[PDB]
Amino acid sequence: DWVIPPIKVSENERGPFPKRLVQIKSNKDRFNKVYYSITGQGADNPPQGVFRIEWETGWMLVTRPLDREEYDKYVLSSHAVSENGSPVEEPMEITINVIDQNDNRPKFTQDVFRGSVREGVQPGTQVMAVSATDEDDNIDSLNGVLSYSILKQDPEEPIPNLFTINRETGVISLIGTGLDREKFPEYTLTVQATDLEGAGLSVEGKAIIQITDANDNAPIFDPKTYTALVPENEIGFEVQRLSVTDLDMPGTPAWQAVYKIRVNEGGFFNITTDPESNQGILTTAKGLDFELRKQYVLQITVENAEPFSVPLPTSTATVTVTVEDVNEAPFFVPAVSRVDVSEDLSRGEKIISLVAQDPDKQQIQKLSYFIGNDPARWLTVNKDNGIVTGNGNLDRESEYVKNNTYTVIMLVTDDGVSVGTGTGTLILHVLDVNDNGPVPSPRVFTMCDQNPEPQVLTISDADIPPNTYPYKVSLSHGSDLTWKAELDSKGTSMLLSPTQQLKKGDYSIYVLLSDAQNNPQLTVVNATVCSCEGKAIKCQ
Numbered sequence: 001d002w003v004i005p006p007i008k009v010s011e012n013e014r015g016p017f018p019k020r021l022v023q024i025k026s027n028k029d030r031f032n033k034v035y036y037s038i039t040g041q042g043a044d045n046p047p048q049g050v051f052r053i054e055w056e057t058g059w060m061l062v063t064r065p066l067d068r069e070e071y072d073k074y075v076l077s078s079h080a081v082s083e084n085g086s087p088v089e090e091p092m093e094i095t096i097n098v099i100d101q102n103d104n105r106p107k108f109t110q111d112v113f114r115g116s117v118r119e120g121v122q123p124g125t126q127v128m129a130v131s132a133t134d135e136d137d138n139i140d141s142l143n144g145v146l147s148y149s150i151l152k153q154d155p156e157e158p159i160p161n162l163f164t165i166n167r168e169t170g171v172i173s174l175i176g177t178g179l180d181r182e183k184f185p186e187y188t189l190t191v192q193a194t195d196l197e198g199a200g201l202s203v204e205g206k207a208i209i210q211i212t213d214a215n216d217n218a219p220i221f222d223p224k225t226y227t228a229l230v231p232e233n234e235i236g237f238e239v240q241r242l243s244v245t246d247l248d249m250p251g252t253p254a255w256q257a258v259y260k261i262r263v264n265e266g267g268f269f270n271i272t273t274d275p276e277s278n279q280g281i282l283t284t285a286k287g288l289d290f291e292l293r294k295q296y297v298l299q300i301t302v303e304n305a306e307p308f309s310v311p312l313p314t315s316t317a318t319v320t321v322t323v324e325d326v327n328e329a330p331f332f333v334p335a336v337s338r339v340d341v342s343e344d345l346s347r348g349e350k351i352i353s354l355v356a357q358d359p360d361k362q363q364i365q366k367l368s369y370f371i372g373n374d375p376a377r378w379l380t381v382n383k384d385n386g387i388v389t390g391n392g393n394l395d396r397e398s399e400y401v402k403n404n405t406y407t408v409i410m411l412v413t414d415d416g417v418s419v420g421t422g423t424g425t426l427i428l429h430v431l432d433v434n435d436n437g438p439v440p441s442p443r444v445f446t447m448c449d450q451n452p453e454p455q456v457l458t459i460s461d462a463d464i465p466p467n468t469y470p471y472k473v474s475l476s477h478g479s480d481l482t483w484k485a486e487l488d489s490k491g492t493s494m495l496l497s498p499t500q501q502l503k504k505g506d507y508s509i510y511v512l513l514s515d516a517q518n519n520p521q522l523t524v525v526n527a528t529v530c531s532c533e534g535k536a537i538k539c540q
């Protein structure tokens with residue numbers, strides 16, 4: 001058909017109501033009276049009564065103002081019946097479009113936006129982002145397009161133009177330079193959005209930016225030069241602690257100190273760090289020792305764990321140390337294999353005039369010499385002059401003496417001012433003299449009767465050679481009660497044989513030898529005889 005165009009109507013209209021929109025006519029009215037009515041939402045349906053028609057003229061009206069924001073369009077159905085009561089025309093659809101008007105102010109997405117950036121970054125860096133909206137049209141008008149802006153950053157210091165915002169997108173960026181967490185950490189700037197691309201109505205928001213941290217700062221010592229005293233030897237011990245103040249953020253690696261000495265003399269120092277006021281705690285690496293050095297001039301520089309965000313001054317601490325003195329024990333010089341001395345020494349004679357030395361050249365402390373180790377008592381010392389003399393009777397020949405030795409240990413004490421011990425061994429070579437003289441091996445026989453065979457006997461000397469070289473056998477009172485002497489060819493033994501057919505048991509034979517001579521006297525080597533033929537038998 002020839003329909004009927006949609007009807008545009010403005011919003012928030014205002015004048016004298018009613019307002020005729022249009023007029024409709026059924027031509028089938030030649031016959032009876034026609035009754036015009038109309039139906040739909042806004043008509044008889046909810047919102048009832050916005051539009052109504054004059055049953056007799058065919059006029060359509062808007063009865064009151066409208067807000068497209070509420071309902072932006074309506075569709076209606078129109079009718080025409082006869083007085084008799086019958087419909088005449090197939091109904092007719094009707095449309096109305098509600099044209100937008102700038103009745104709406106915009107509104108920010110949130111009531112407050114927050115942001116953060118680091119202090120050392122470069123100009124032209126994107127920080128935050130902000131939103132807002134207008135409910136009016138924005139597809140055929142500007143009643144709903146906004147334009148963003150900024151008008152007041154607080155801390156109007158260092159300067160007041162650190163940022164800008166993209167008018168269309170509302171994004172903010174760092175424009176200037178001079179950000180420092182250490183002086184001004186959080187800005188509060190006021191934003192506004194406007195109707196018709198900055199032309200219409202405006203509103204406010206608030207965005208707040210916190211500033212991350214940077215290693216803008218270096219560490220600073222609170223003393224620059226310290227001093228402490230120290231002892232030579234127990235040690236590995238705490239000398240002095242140090243103080244400092246970095247200014248970036250505390251629990252952070254831009255706040256933790258790292259040290260080191262420049263030069264470690266004997267490399268006898270270690271230094272650690274501590275999460276207190278991360279003071280510098282210095283200590284001794286390997287004890288000290290001395291009388292060698294009293295002075296210690298060393299320097300320690302301090303850094304952070306992480307590198308610096310800028311060239312900065314490295315700052316050292318210069319420190320002086322002094323070693324207190326402890327006084328140590330003295331010592332005999334050697335451990336003496338000294339005196340190759342003979343057995344004939346006169347009880348009270350100079351053996352070893354000895355001396356001991358003591359470390360501490362503070363030496364105005366003497367000591368006393370004491371002896372100590374010990375198989376039995378011979379020797380003697382002058383305690384205030386360390387003089388070892390030889391008292392007593394010695395005898396290389398016999399008991400304690402093991403290999404050609406006699407080892408003895410002695411002491412010495414550090415007095416004068418405190419304490420001390422000195423353990424020193426002393427081996428002294430004893431010597432030989434020909435003391436003893438020759439002696440027979442077996443002392444009792446068992447001779448036989450009829451024809452006894454030679455009674456083997458031998459010789460032994462306690463002395464050391466030559467002193468036991470060859471012999472000379474001799475038979476004293478009974479050199480004839482019949483007894484005849486004899487030597488083995490290979491030196492050592494002697495052959496003892498009677499020369500008479502003598503008696504039934506129990507009787508001695510006086511013996512007498514010599515080796516350089518010395519002559520011993522020996523003696524009786526008794527002789528038990530019991531009935532027989534010729535071989536030395538078990539007796540009775």
Ligand SMILES: *[C@@H]1O[C@H](CO)[C@@H](O)[C@H](O)[C@H]1NC(C)=O
Pocket residue numbers: 153154155156186187188189208
């Ligand atoms: C930003 O927020 C802080 C915290 O309240 C406030 O003290 C300051 O005045 C605001 N503006 C700037 C630029 O710091």
Ligand SMILES: *[C@@H]1O[C@H](CO)[C@@H](O)[C@H](O)[C@H]1NC(C)=O
Pocket residue numbers: 223225226227228229
């Ligand atoms: C020396 O060391 C002591 C240790 O107690 C310290 O108090 C002092 O500051 C250091 N410097 C000087 C010059 O004494």
Ligand SMILES: *[C@@H]1O[C@H](CO)[C@@H](O)[C@H](O)[C@H]1NC(C)=O
Pocket residue numbers: 220221222244245246247
């Ligand atoms: C660190 O020590 C320096 C030296 O006096 C001082 O100026 C600074 O204020 C100290 N740091 C802090 C946080 O006080």
Ligand SMILES: *[C@@H]1O[C@H](CO)[C@@H](O)[C@H](O)[C@H]1NC(C)=O
Pocket residue numbers: 257258259260271272273274275
């Ligand atoms: C202190 O500094 C030294 C030197 O680098 C380091 O080895 C040590 O681990 C530090 N102490 C601590 C607790 O970090």
Ligand SMILES: *[C@@H]1O[C@H](CO)[C@@H](O)[C@H](O)[C@H]1NC(C)=O
Pocket residue numbers: 225226227296297319320321
């Ligand atoms: C530390 O060493 C320096 C360098 O010679 C010296 O001036 C200072 O006296 C020493 N001790 C003290 C107490 O500073």
Ligand SMILES: *[C@@H]1O[C@H](CO)[C@@H](O)[C@H](O)[C@H]1NC(C)=O
Pocket residue numbers: 375400401402405406407408
């Ligand atoms: C001699 O030194 C040795 C070796 O230590 C030791 O066993 C002995 O007791 C010391 N005295 C004598 C008399 O041998």
Ligand SMILES: *[C@@H]1O[C@H](CO)[C@@H](O)[C@H](O)[C@H]1NC(C)=O
Pocket residue numbers: 413419420421422
């Ligand atoms: C010296 O050392 C000895 C070790 O035999 C020890 O018994 C003594 O206590 C020490 N003397 C002193 C005066 O400290």
Ligand SMILES: *[C@@H]1O[C@H](CO)[C@@H](O)[C@H](O)[C@H]1NC(C)=O
Pocket residue numbers: 421422423424
């Ligand atoms: C010295 O005397 C000390 C103190 O008893 C002792 O421990 C040490 O064994 C002794 N000997 C030596 C050779 O120092």
Ligand SMILES: *[C@@H]1O[C@H](CO)[C@@H](O)[C@H](O)[C@H]1NC(C)=O
Pocket residue numbers: 506507508523524525526
């Ligand atoms: C040997 O026997 C005699 C005879 O009785 C006795 O007098 C003597 O003591 C015994 N031994 C020695 C070594 O004299």
Ligand SMILES: *[C@H]1O[C@H](CO)[C@@H](O)[C@H](O)[C@H]1NC(C)=O
Pocket residue numbers: 270271272
């Ligand atoms: C010093 O002492 C600390 C504590 O035991 C140890 O961990 C470190 O290895 C030593 N040496 C240094 C150079 O720090």
Ligand SMILES: *[C@H]1O[C@H](CO)[C@@H](O)[C@H](O)[C@H]1NC(C)=O
Pocket residue numbers: 301303311312313314
């Ligand atoms: C000083 O030395 C430290 C390393 O010990 C270094 O990191 C720092 O950059 C130096 N100072 C300067 C101005 O380069």
Ligand SMILES: *[C@H]1O[C@H](CO)[C@@H](O)[C@H](O)[C@H]1NC(C)=O
Pocket residue numbers: 224225299314315316317318
């Ligand atoms: C510490 O002080 C000494 C003496 O004044 C100096 O040699 C050293 O360089 C100083 N360290 C610093 C960082 O000034």
Ligand SMILES: *[C@H]1O[C@H](CO)[C@@H](O)[C@H](O)[C@H]1NC(C)=O
Pocket residue numbers: 301314315316317
């Ligand atoms: C530490 O400071 C002293 C004096 O200020 C300086 O001479 C020295 O070069 C510094 N050490 C380091 C490693 O920077």
Ligand SMILES: *[C@H]1O[C@H](CO)[C@@H](O)[C@H](O)[C@H]1NC(C)=O
Pocket residue numbers: 334335336409423424425426
């Ligand atoms: C005494 O000192 C000597 C060093 O000549 C050593 O060989 C010996 O073990 C020491 N004896 C003791 C008990 O100290």
Ligand SMILES: *[C@H]1O[C@H](CO)[C@@H](O)[C@H](O)[C@H]1NC(C)=O
Pocket residue numbers: 402403404405
């Ligand atoms: C005696 O001398 C020998 C040879 O020098 C030596 O090796 C030994 O130790 C000493 N004493 C003993 C019991 O062997």
Ligand SMILES: [Ca+2]
Pocket residue numbers: 011012066067068069103
């Ligand atoms: Ca409206």
